[PDB]
Write an enzyme that holds these catalytic residues in place. Structure first.
Site, PDB file in Angstrom:
ATOM      1  N   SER A  64       0.834  -1.241  -0.041  1.00  0.00           N
ATOM      2  CA  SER A  64       0.096  -0.003  -0.106  1.00  0.00           C
ATOM      3  C   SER A  64       0.782   1.340   0.071  1.00  0.00           C
ATOM      4  CB  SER A  64      -0.947  -0.155   1.268  1.00  0.00           C
ATOM      5  OG  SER A  64      -1.966  -1.168   0.972  1.00  0.00           O
ATOM      6  N   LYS A  67       0.133   3.377  -2.897  1.00  0.00           N
ATOM      7  CA  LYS A  67      -0.990   4.348  -2.934  1.00  0.00           C
ATOM      8  C   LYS A  67      -0.281   5.990  -3.037  1.00  0.00           C
ATOM      9  CE  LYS A  67      -4.261   1.384  -0.701  1.00  0.00           C
ATOM     10  NZ  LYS A  67      -3.401  -0.024  -0.738  1.00  0.00           N
ATOM     11  N   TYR A 150     -10.812   2.452   4.559  1.00  0.00           N
ATOM     12  CA  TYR A 150      -9.684   2.423   3.823  1.00  0.00           C
ATOM     13  C   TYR A 150     -10.015   1.116   2.937  1.00  0.00           C
ATOM     14  CZ  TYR A 150      -4.582   1.190   3.355  1.00  0.00           C
ATOM     15  OH  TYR A 150      -3.309   0.932   2.756  1.00  0.00           O
ATOM     16  N   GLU A 272      -0.532   9.539   5.426  1.00  0.00           N
ATOM     17  CA  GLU A 272      -1.349   9.952   6.654  1.00  0.00           C
ATOM     18  C   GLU A 272      -0.758  11.021   7.346  1.00  0.00           C
ATOM     19  OE1 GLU A 272      -1.524   6.424   8.788  1.00  0.00           O
ATOM     20  OE2 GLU A 272      -2.482   5.194   7.401  1.00  0.00           O
ATOM     21  N   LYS A 312       3.117   6.141   6.251  1.00  0.00           N
ATOM     22  CA  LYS A 312       2.482   5.247   5.273  1.00  0.00           C
ATOM     23  C   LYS A 312       3.182   3.671   5.603  1.00  0.00           C
ATOM     24  CE  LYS A 312      -1.153   3.836   3.182  1.00  0.00           C
ATOM     25  NZ  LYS A 312      -1.315   2.722   3.768  1.00  0.00           N
ATOM     26  N   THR A 313       2.191   2.870   5.849  1.00  0.00           N
ATOM     27  CA  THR A 313       2.379   1.427   5.989  1.00  0.00           C
ATOM     28  C   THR A 313       2.094   0.683   4.739  1.00  0.00           C
ATOM     29  OG1 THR A 313       0.220   0.768   7.121  1.00  0.00           O
ATOM     30  CG2 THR A 313       2.406   1.120   8.588  1.00  0.00           C
ATOM     31  N   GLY A 314       2.490  -0.379   4.400  1.00  0.00           N
ATOM     32  CA  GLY A 314       2.453  -1.020   3.075  1.00  0.00           C
ATOM     33  C   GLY A 314       2.691  -2.393   3.275  1.00  0.00           C
ATOM     34  N   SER A 315       1.915  -3.426   2.807  1.00  0.00           N
ATOM     35  CA  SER A 315       2.125  -5.015   2.835  1.00  0.00           C
ATOM     36  C   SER A 315       1.572  -5.692   1.556  1.00  0.00           C
ATOM     37  CB  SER A 315       1.498  -5.481   4.213  1.00  0.00           C
ATOM     38  OG  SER A 315       2.095  -4.978   5.322  1.00  0.00           O
TER      39      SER A 315
END
Ligand code: XQN
Ligand code: CL
Ligand code: NA
Length: 359
Positions: A64, A67, A150, A272, A312-315
């Site tokens: 993510s 994004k 989300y 964010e 921002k986190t993403g996985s």
């Protein structure tokens, strides 16, 4: 081997390296950019079976964090006049004209407030035609614009529309326009044959090598792969947009503007946003199950904080990502792993490093 090199190496060894053993992570890249200088730390293996070490060429799946590039593309098109955030998707995807989803505007798609779009598409939505039917058959659930949920389909539809407004497929928007504008040299939606040797394997709980599978609107929602040096360049561009040409500079700045508030979190485009200094608890709360997985009523912004930070986190199935930057401190951090680890651990380790580092 400057004092700063050694300080950051110690900080990353103290706070990120223990996660490799705790979560059985094969490979990791952690970078800090401070004073416009990149500090890069590499651990372990991009491919276990090949005994290929993680290095500055290693390509990771951003999940993510993709994004953020979709948001940047949106800011680019908006400030070139290709879209207005007040438009609706049927202006561009003509098959959606006069359907219920054509009552939702692009800003609401980008910031997850359509009122009826979940984290993921239904499992049964896979082909292009099924995606089209999904949106043609869409109907409102919650009051449009009032609830943040989300959502991959939401920002994925935003990205598709952004691409349509630019008369290019989304992958080309990023690989031909946005990535070169940001100075990125090894960032991809589709990794080319000549770079597959640099593409890490991700690893699941059985330590089997995996990579992201095709999915509906995957590219704008979670489809970007990049290297630690490229991601530090991306953080540099968010820290120093005045140094970039007008078109991408305006796009970057566009992604920083808070659009509404949910408790202590401001939703910018992709990013964010928080008042800085932010407490650890505030940053952790942003990735709580309540915020990530459930609808939350939004509140209009009365006063955007004058001093801010963003993350921002993403996985993906096989990868974890965290990015964070603080304009007033001209500092940022990127974490890339080829096994998922809990988001709270990523946020906590980055917090410890950025707050211990000598300014
Ligand atoms: B993208 O990285 O963000 C979403 C959600 N990621 S997650 O790992 O499913 C998650 C994270 C925190 C909580 Cl509290 C729950 C779940 C996503 C979903 C699919 C693909 C990419 C991304
Ligand atoms: Cl995530
Ligand atoms: Na999805």
């Amino acid at each position: 081997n400057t004092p700063k090199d050694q300080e950051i190496k110690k900080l990353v060894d103290q706070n990120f390296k223990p996660l490799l053993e705790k979560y059985d992570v094969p490979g990791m890249a952690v970078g800090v950019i401070q004073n416009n200088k990149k500090y890069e730390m590499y651990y372990g293996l991009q491919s276990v079976q090949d005994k290929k070490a993680v290095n500055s060429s290693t390509i990771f799946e951003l999940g993510s964090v993709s994004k953020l590039f979709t948001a940047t593309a949106g800011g680019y098109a908006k400030n070139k006049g290709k879209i207005s955030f007040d438009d609706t998707p049927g202006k561009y995807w003509k098959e959606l004209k006069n359907t219920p989803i054509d009552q939702v505007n692009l800003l609401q798609l980008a910031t997850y407030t359509s009122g009826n779009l979940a984290l993921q598409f239904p499992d049964e939505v896979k082909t292009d035609q099924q995606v089209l039917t999904f949106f043609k058959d869409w109907k409102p659930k919650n009051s449009i614009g009032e609830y943040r949920q989300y959502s991959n389909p939401s920002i994925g539809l935003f990205g598709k529309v952004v691409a349509l407004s630019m008369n290019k497929p989304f992958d080309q928007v990023l690989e031909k326009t946005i990535f070169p504008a940001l100075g990125l040299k090894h960032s991809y939606v589709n990794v080319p044959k000549t770079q597959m040797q640099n593409y890490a394997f991700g690893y699941n709980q059985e330590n089997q090598p995996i990579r992201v599978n095709p999915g509906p609107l995957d590219a704008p929602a979670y489809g970007v792969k990049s290297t630690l040096p490229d991601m530090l360049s991306f953080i540099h561009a968010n820290l120093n947009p005045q140094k970039y040409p007008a078109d991408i500079q305006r796009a970057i700045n566009e992604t920083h503007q808070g659009r509404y508030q949910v408790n202590t979190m401001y939703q910018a485009l992709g990013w964010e946003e928080f008042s800085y200094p932010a407490t650890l608890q505030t940053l952790l709360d942003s990735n709580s199950e309540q915020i990530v997985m459930k609808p939350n009523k939004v509140t209009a912004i009365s006063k955007e904080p004058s001093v801010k930070m963003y993350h921002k986190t993403g996985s993906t199935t096989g990868f974890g990502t965290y990015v964070v930057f603080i304009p007033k401190e001209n500092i940022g951090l990127v974490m890339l792993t080829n096994k998922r680890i809990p988001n709270e651990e990523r946020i906590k380790a980055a917090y410890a490093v950025l707050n211990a580092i000598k300014k």
